[PDB]
Amino acid sequence: YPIINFTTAGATVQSYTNFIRAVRGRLTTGADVRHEIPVLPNRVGLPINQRFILVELSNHAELSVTLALDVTNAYVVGYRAGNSAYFFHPDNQEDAEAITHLFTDVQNRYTFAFGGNYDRLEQLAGNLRENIELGNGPLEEAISALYYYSTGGTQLPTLARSFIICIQMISEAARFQYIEGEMRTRIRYNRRSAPDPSVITLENSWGRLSTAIQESNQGAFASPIQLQRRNGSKFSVYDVSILIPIIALMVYRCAPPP
Amino acid sequence: YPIINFTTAGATVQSYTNFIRAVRGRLTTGADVRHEIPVLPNRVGLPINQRFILVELSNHAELSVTLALDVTNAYVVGYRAGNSAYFFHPDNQEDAEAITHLFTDVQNRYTFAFGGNYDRLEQLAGNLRENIELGNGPLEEAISALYYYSTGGTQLPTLARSFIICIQMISEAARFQYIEGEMRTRIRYNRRSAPDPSVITLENSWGRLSTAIQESNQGAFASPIQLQRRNGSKFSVYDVSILIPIIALMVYRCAPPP
Numbered sequence: 001y002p003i004i005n006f007t008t009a010g011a012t013v014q015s016y017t018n019f020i021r022a023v024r025g026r027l028t029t030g031a032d033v034r035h036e037i038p039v040l041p042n043r044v045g046l047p048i049n050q051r052f053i054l055v056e057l058s059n060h061a062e063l064s065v066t067l068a069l070d071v072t073n074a075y076v077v078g079y080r081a082g083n084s085a086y087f088f089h090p091d092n093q094e095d096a097e098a099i100t101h102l103f104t105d106v107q108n109r110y111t112f113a114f115g116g117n118y119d120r121l122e123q124l125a126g127n128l129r130e131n132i133e134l135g136n137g138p139l140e141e142a143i144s145a146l147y148y149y150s151t152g153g154t155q156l157p158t159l160a161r162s163f164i165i166c167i168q169m170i171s172e173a174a175r176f177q178y179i180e181g182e183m184r185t186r187i188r189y190n191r192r193s194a195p196d197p198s199v200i201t202l203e204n205s206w207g208r209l210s211t212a213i214q215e216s217n218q219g220a221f222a223s224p225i226q227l228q229r230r231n232g233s234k235f236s237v238y239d240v241s242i243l244i245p246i247i248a249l250m251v252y253r254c255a256p257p258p
Numbered sequence: 259y260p261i262i263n264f265t266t267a268g269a270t271v272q273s274y275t276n277f278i279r280a281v282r283g284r285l286t287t288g289a290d291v292r293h294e295i296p297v298l299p300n301r302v303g304l305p306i307n308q309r310f311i312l313v314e315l316s317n318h319a320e321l322s323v324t325l326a327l328d329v330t331n332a333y334v335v336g337y338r339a340g341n342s343a344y345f346f347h348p349d350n351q352e353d354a355e356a357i358t359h360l361f362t363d364v365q366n367r368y369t370f371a372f373g374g375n376y377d378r379l380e381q382l383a384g385n386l387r388e389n390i391e392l393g394n395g396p397l398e399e400a401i402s403a404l405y406y407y408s409t410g411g412t413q414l415p416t417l418a419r420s421f422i423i424c425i426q427m428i429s430e431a432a433r434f435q436y437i438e439g440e441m442r443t444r445i446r447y448n449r450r451s452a453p454d455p456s457v458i459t460l461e462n463s464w465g466r467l468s469t470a471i472q473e474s475n476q477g478a479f480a481s482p483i484q485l486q487r488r489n490g491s492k493f494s495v496y497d498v499s500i501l502i503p504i505i506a507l508m509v510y511r512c513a514p515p516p
Contacts, residue, residue: 035499218497220478239476239497241293 001068001102002026002053008140009060013184016136023174024248026053027074034256035219035240039210042252043072043094048101052077055170059143067166068102070095073251074171076116076163077102081150084108088116116163118203125160129168129200134183135192138165168195168203176202178246197228202246210250213240259326259360260284260311266398267318271442274394281432282506284311285332292514293477293498297468300510301330301352306359310335313428317401325424326360328353331509332429334374334421335360339408342366346374374421376461383418387426387458392441393450396423426453426461434460436504455486460504468508471498 004026006019024038032039041050051071058064066080077099078087085103089112090096103109114120122128132138142162148154154162173180179199186193195203205227212221216239224236237243262284264277282296290297299308309329316322324338335357336345343361347370348354361367372378380386390396400420406412412420431438437457444451453461463485470479474497482494495501 216497218495219499220497237476239474239478241477241499 001051003056003066004053005056005058007058008136008143009058011136011187013188016184016187017180020170020173020180023053023055023069023074023170027069027071027174027249032252032256034214034250035216036244037213037240037247037250039214039250039252040074041072046072048098051098052102057139057143057166059140061140061144063144063147065143065146066103067170068099069171070098074174074249076167076171079146080106081147084110084150086149087111089114091115116167118164118167121160121164125157125164127161129164129195129203130197131194132161132164133192133194134165134168135186136190137192139169142166168199172199172203175206175249176246177248178202180248196230197232198230201228206247207251207253209237209243209247211253212237213243213247213250214253214256216240259309261314261324262311263314263316265316266394266401267316269394269445271446274442274445275438278428278431278438281311281313281327281332281428285327285329285432285507290510290514292472292508293474294502295471295498295505295508297472297508297510298332299330304330306356309356310360315397315401315424317398319398319402321402321405323401323404324361325428326357327429328356332432332507334425334429337404338364339405342368342408344407345369347372349373374425376422376425379418379422383415383422385419387422387453387461388455389452390419390422391450391452392423392426393444394448395450397427400424426457430457430461433464433507434504435506436460438506454488455490456488459486464505465509465511467495467501467505469511470495471501471505471508472511472514474498 004019004022027040028038029041052068053071055067055069056064057067068077068079069075070077078085080103083106085106085108087099090099114124118129125132142165145154145158145162149159168179169183173183179202182195182199205225208225212225219240221238224238226234226236229235262277262280285298286296287299288296310326311329313325313327314322315325326335326337327333328335336343338361341364343364343366345357348357372382376387383390400423403412403416403420407417426437427441431441437460440453440457463483466483470483477498479496482496484492484494487493
């Protein structure tokens with residue numbers, strides 16, 4: 001499977017930008033663009049040989065970890081650290097079967113009993129997304145926490161907090177140009193901050209937006225989608241136009257009409 | 259006032275294309291673009307020195323006539339042929355006052371008792387738009403009919419039929435890329451044909467479309483606009499997106515929101 005590498009050591013908005021750009025390029029085929037927004041491959045018919053891409057993250061402590069992303073949704077399915085492999089609980093049989101093709105050479109393959117959705121992970125971490133700080137520093141630390149879990153070194157709540165960080169800085173940033181933009185700013189000023197309501201609402205709405213756009217009438221939504229501005233105020237979306245510069249990838253919801 | 263010249267003598271899709279492109283360039287300031295579609299100047303505040311542009315049409319018989327277009331709507335207000343000037347009946351006082359600045363040097367200025375809208379003109383011509391043929395040949399003839407009206411040579415129904423032709427090949431073609439496209443085809447194959455339902459519906463809907471677009475929610479229309487395909491079948495418009503490559507200019511309906 002394709003591997004993309006990134007290192008938090010001495011990262012810059014440019015090195016981070018190139019990274020997210022490469023991930024997007026690996027996730028999508030260019031075969032499906034809907035209102036200038038690329039759609040991810042459809043799960044039905046997709047061969048396993050083209051089901052995942054790996055992201056090898058390294059940090060300043062010289063520790064490495066490899067995350068596995070499912071190409072049909074940009075979801076982090078599991079990771080490899082040294083000799084072990086951990087996978088979130090598959091939510092179906094095809095998925096439980098697909099992940100058997102990953103990190104086939106690791107000696108210890110483990111499957112968590114919990115899944116990788118935010119609700120579960122915020123529960124296991126004891127903090128909400130609004131409270132977990134994002135930035136290069138938090139990512140640097142997450143690579144170590146994820147790495148040392150494999151050696152008895154990391155606690156369950158820290159494993160969960162670390163995934164929450166990795167998922168927003170990689171998968172969420174790859175899906176939304178808006179969110180990747182928020183990360184680039186944290187990196188530029190070396191800030192470390194929790195995500196505001198705009199980031200969180202977009203994260204929560206990715207699937208609804210992907211459906212609304214794909215089933216819009218010439219780009220017009222049948223019913224508006226309410227989002228939030230950085231200052232917490234509501235803001236309705238009625239057309240795919242305002243989202244073109246905000247959303248980068250869409251999950252496959254339906255075939256395009258003639 | 260700016261003058262654009264066109265000659266039907268030996269015209270080609272290219273010479274016709276350059277012409278309509280030049281007219282559009284004179285009509286609009288570039289100061290107002292709404293969803294990638296230029297909006298014509300607003301009548302309120304517009305100085306008379308920037309109220310019109312003249313189109314000097316010449317034909318193979320070496321006859322010339324100069325049409326006057328109102329910049330705020332691309333409407334043909336009148337023409338000059340030799341020593342005389344004819345103006346459709348102004349529908350208000352500012353307009354009756356504005357046209358007093360045109361063809362000030364002609365010796366005989368006449369103002370028709372009828373206006374220049376299609377309904378009136380189809381009545382005076384004794385035929386509907388669907389029945390009057392369009393092409394370079396029909397335009398060539400219209401320049402002569404319009405020219406000889408000034409010398410007792412043309413009959414009222416022929417004057418009206420000739421305006422109907424000039425207006426669709428100049429004003430209507432300048433407003434819609436779609437309609438200019440239909441003319442380019444007539445010219446290329448030297449066809450001469452009456453306009454189909456698609457052309458006519460677009461002509462009829464220019465003002466509604468200009469309002470719907472300008473008052474759309476992020477490009478979404480509050481209520482759909484029904485148009486017709488070349489084969490007479492209805493086709494609903496819900497978003498400004500499908501019109502971007504169809505409509506070239508819009509009449510000013512309202513100020514753009516923040």
